[PDB]
């Protein structure tokens, strides 16, 4: 844990009233596969905030992958106010015990979805 980072650019399509979380890449998180690599997968959902578990495409034998991967957040900015953005780097290792790699906790009230949210966001240690 203390995962490294995942830089993103999250945008709003407001006339479907949904947020968009198009990250970039996560970099150099611990390997859960038999090749000193991982098969990254990002869990992205909220509570009654929008409990929509979306999923990154699995990046085989690399935990430092760059997708620019859209986390579909079907909640308006006005609706953001209550909402809690949790994001979870999870390794789908298809065989062994799946280790949760990392996570980040992102409260809506701190995230400005006026236009495009571009900042380099770090994967913090998850203990799940």
From Swiss-Prot:
Glycosylated. It comes from the Eukaryota. The modification Phosphoserine is found at residue 125. Residues 2-121 form the C2 domain. Disulfide bonds: none annotated. The modification Phosphotyrosine is found at residue 90. Ca(2+) 3 binds at residues 93, 96-97, 99. Expressed in melanocytes. Ca(2+) 1 binds at residues 33, 39, 91-93. It is found in: Cytoplasmic vesicle, Secretory vesicle membrane; Cytoplasmic vesicle, Secretory vesicle, Synaptic vesicle membrane; Cytoplasmic vesicle, Secretory vesicle, Chromaffin granule membrane; Cytoplasm. Ca(2+) 2 binds at residues 32-33, 91, 93, 99. The first C2 domain mediates Ca(2+)-dependent phospholipid binding. It is linked to Baker-Gordon syndrome: An autosomal dominant neurodevelopmental disorder characterized by infantile hypotonia, congenital ophthalmic abnormalities, involuntary and hyperkinetic movements, stereotypic behavior, poor or absent speech, EEG abnormalities, and global developmental delay varying in severity from moderate to profound. Behavioral characteristics include sleep disturbance and episodic agitation. Belongs to the synaptotagmin family. Calcium sensor that participates in triggering neurotransmitter release at the synapse. May have a regulatory role in the membrane interactions during trafficking of synaptic vesicles at the active zone of the synapse. It binds acidic phospholipids with a specificity that requires the presence of both an acidic head group and a diacyl backbone. A Ca(2+)-dependent interaction between synaptotagmin and putative receptors for activated protein kinase C has also been reported. It can bind to at least three additional proteins in a Ca(2+)-independent manner; these are neurexins, syntaxin and AP2. Homotetramer. Heterodimer; heterodimerizes with SYT2 in presence of calcium. Interacts with SCAMP5. Interacts with STON2. Forms a complex with SV2B, syntaxin 1 and SNAP25. Interacts with SV2A, SV2B and SV2C. Interacts with RIMS1. Interacts with PRRT2. Interacts with DNAJC5 in a phosphorylation-dependent manner. Interacts (via N-terminus) with RAB3A. Interacts with SYT12. Interacts with calmodulin. Interacts with DNM1 (via C-terminal proline-rich domain (PRD)); this interaction facilitates vesicle fission during clathrin-mediated endocytosis (CME). This is Synaptotagmin-1. The lineage of its organism: Eukaryota, Metazoa, Chordata, Craniata, Vertebrata. The chain holds residues 141 to 268 of 422 of the full protein.
């Amino acid at each position: 844990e203390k995962l490294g980072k995942l830089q993103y650019s999250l945008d709003y399509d407001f006339q479907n009233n949904q947020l968009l979380v198009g990250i970039i890449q996560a970099a150099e998180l611990p390997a859960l596969d038999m090749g000193g690599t991982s098969d990254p997968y990002v869990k992205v959902f909220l509570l009654p905030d929008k409990k929509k578990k979306f999923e990154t495409k699995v990046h085989r034998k690399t935990l430092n992958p760059v997708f620019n991967e859209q986390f579909t957040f079907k909640v308006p900015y006005s609706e953001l106010g209550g909402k809690t953005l949790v994001m979870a780097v999870y390794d789908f290792d298809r065989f062994s015990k799946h280790d949760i790699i990392g996570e980040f906790k992102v409260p809506m009230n701190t995230v400005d979805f006026g236009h495009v949210t571009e900042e380099w966001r770090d994967l913090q240690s998850a203990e799940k």
